[PDB]
Write a protein that binds this DNA or RNA. Structure first.
Length: 546
RNA sequence: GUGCUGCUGUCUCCCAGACGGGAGGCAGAACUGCACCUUC
DNA sequence: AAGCATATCG
DNA sequence: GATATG
């Protein structure tokens, strides 16, 4: 029902108290994850930082449960599982024992807890006020039965206040529920957990106003946020570095436990935005502390047909007669695009010439099709001089890969200079060179992957991950800018309805491009639906017939 | 603030095997442009 | 899988 | 304000 947007703000001088709170929250969250997994008393698998998976048997979980304060698990097993499935939301939603998973911590950890006795929020009590013995869910009944057995108030490894425990339990339950859904999807084929860590896999340490986590206050001074976190040990004050997503912020404490923030998103438009902040998430990434600010926001005949081409970024028609037509995102630099295509082809053919060379080295020519495929296309596409011997051929391939790498670096630098060569004005918002670079890097990653595995016969996870990062980031940026261009063209033309259908399918699944454009068009207030310039005209006409 | 996103100098690890490739850490110069919902 | 609300007694 | 449960 609600709508969210998000951004991170970096904080530099984090006091020791906040770092200790962060680390303790991560440790207790890992403890809760392991405890909930142990309560199911079923064998599972966990993957560590090295990437290999270990399988934990039932005996280790039994030992952990006995360490956590339950001296006789096998005699109370049916209760524990009955509790755990309630926490992970594996019961009927109508009779949910814990609507939010944090609610169990009072039963889990508190000594003098009175949970499970109060009934003021029961609808029957409300109706009697206006004028439970069987109503109790199995999840709460099992928890009470465990508590009265002297078993359930487990020993938390590190002492924390109730609110921080609730936040840690919330994060742990979220991760475990996601893993459990994945495990169900895997078992239904006819699945490994990942314990949270302070640096290798952080959880969002949450601060909230209603009671989940410690309370927080945020204000704005000039162009930066000032955040005060109300830890039990004091009140830590922080100042975030200015962010161009929140360039000129100004906040107001609302009367409904929320902070209204008004900011300016630095773009060409510099449009003002308003949002509501209610929870804040501290996270550590490579030694730097970022607060995830997730803010709610309020979303806002002329029709268009949109065609998502590859050589043009898109073609639009507006309108019966189409008095407005055009293309957006054409080729900007002819020679750059041509060189990009040539290098992509070179890498594509080299990836196969490597395998053919290995086969020749270890077995010799096998059949006519291998030799002909090498001679007609692999030799000139990877243009290179053939060598009969093994090591000389390997050295020639090495020289060819060096040349390819140098050309790739030059092409990347030229593409980067599109925003800094005093010709920024000529540069368009979107162009086909983005997709061409994506294809080029996808082919080049494969080429280097084949090259690195030359030594072994035909027969670490850090390999080439910089290229993976670049590919993913460039693809995300391309999608963002394409969506921006589409919505900008829609809004400038005053359209109210949009109709829309080595290719796009190889870069994205059929869904997320359409879903992203649909969501962004709806957010601005423009409706859209699924059914060159002629294709866009045809799409618009097809929508018009309906 | 995350990216688009690079260049130069320098340093440390890994795969080879004297042809090359891979992952990062610092120090500079240049430009200050274009978009941004994120975690699992 | 998520990025809160509301009641009650003190 | 501190629990507690929608």
């Amino acid at each position: 029902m609600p709508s969210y947007k998000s951004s991170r703000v970096l904080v530099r001088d984090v006091p020791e108290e906040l770092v200790d709170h962060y680390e303790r929250s991560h440790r207790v969250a890992a403890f809760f994850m392991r405890l909930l997994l142990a309560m199911r008393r079923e064998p599972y698998s966990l993957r560590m930082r090295d990437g290999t998976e270990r399988e934990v048997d039932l005996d280790e979980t039994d030992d952990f449960l006995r360490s956590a304060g339950c001296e006789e698990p096998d005699a109370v097993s049916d209760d524990l599982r009955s509790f755990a499935l309630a926490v992970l939301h594996q019961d009927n939603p109508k009779k949910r024992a814990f609507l939010k998973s944090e609610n169990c911590v009072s039963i889990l950890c508190l000594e003098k807890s009175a949970s499970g006795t109060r009934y003021y929020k029961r609808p029957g009590y409300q109706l009697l006020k206006k004028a439970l013995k069987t109503d109790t869910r199995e999840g709460m009944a099992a928890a009470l039965r465990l508590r009265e057995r002297g078993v359930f108030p487990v020993s938390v490894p590190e002492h924390l206040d109730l609110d921080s425990l609730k936040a840690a339990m919330a994060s742990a339950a979220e991760r475990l529920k996601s893993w459990l859904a994945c495990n169900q999807r895997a078992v239904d084929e006819k699945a490994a957990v990942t314990l949270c860590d302070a640096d290798d896999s952080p959880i969002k340490v949450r601060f909230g106003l209603t009671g989940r986590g410690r309370k927080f206050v945020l204000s704005a001074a000039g162009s930066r946020f000032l955040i005060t976190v109300k830890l039990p040990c004091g009140d830590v004050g922080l100042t975030a570095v200015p962010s161009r997503y929140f360039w000129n912020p100004s906040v107001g404490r609302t009367t409904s436990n929320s902070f209204r923030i008004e900011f300016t998103k630095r773009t060409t438009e510099n449009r003002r935005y308003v949002g509501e902040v209610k929870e804040i998430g501290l996270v550590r990434q490579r030694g730097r502390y970022y607060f995830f600010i997730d803010y709610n926001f309020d979303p806002e005949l002329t029709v268009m047909g949109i065609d998502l081409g590859i050589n043009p970024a898109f073609a639009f028609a507006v309108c019966v007669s189409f008095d407005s037509t055009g293309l957006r995102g054409g080729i900007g630099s002819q020679k750059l695009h041509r060189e990009m295509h040539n290098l992509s082809d070179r890498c594509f053919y080299g990836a196969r010439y490597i395998r053919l060379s290995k086969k020749l080295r270890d077995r010799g020519a096998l059949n006519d099709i291998e030799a002909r495929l090498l001679e007609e296309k692999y030799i000139p596409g990877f243009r290179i001089v053939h060598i009969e011997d093994a090591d000389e051929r390997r050295r020639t391939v090495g020289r060819t890969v060096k040349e390819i790498k140098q050309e790739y670096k030059r092409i990347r630098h030229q593409f980067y200079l599109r925003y800094h060569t005093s010709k920024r004005d000529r540069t368009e918002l979107i162009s086909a060179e983005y997709f061409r670079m994506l294809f080029l890097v996808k082919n080049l990653r494969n080429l280097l992957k084949s090259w690195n595995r030359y030594h072994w016969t035909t027969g670490n996870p850090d390999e080439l991950k910089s290229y993976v990062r670049y590919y993913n980031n460039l693809r995300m940026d391309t999608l963002k800018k394409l969506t921006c261009a589409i919505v900008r063209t829609a809004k400038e033309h005053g359209a109210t309805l949009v109709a829309m259908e080595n290719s796009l399918l190889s870069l994205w699944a059929p869904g997320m491009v359409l879903e992203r454009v649909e969501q962004e068009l709806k957010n601005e207030g423009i409706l859209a639906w699924e059914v060159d310039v002629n294709a866009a005209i045809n799409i618009a006409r097809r929508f018009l017939t309906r």
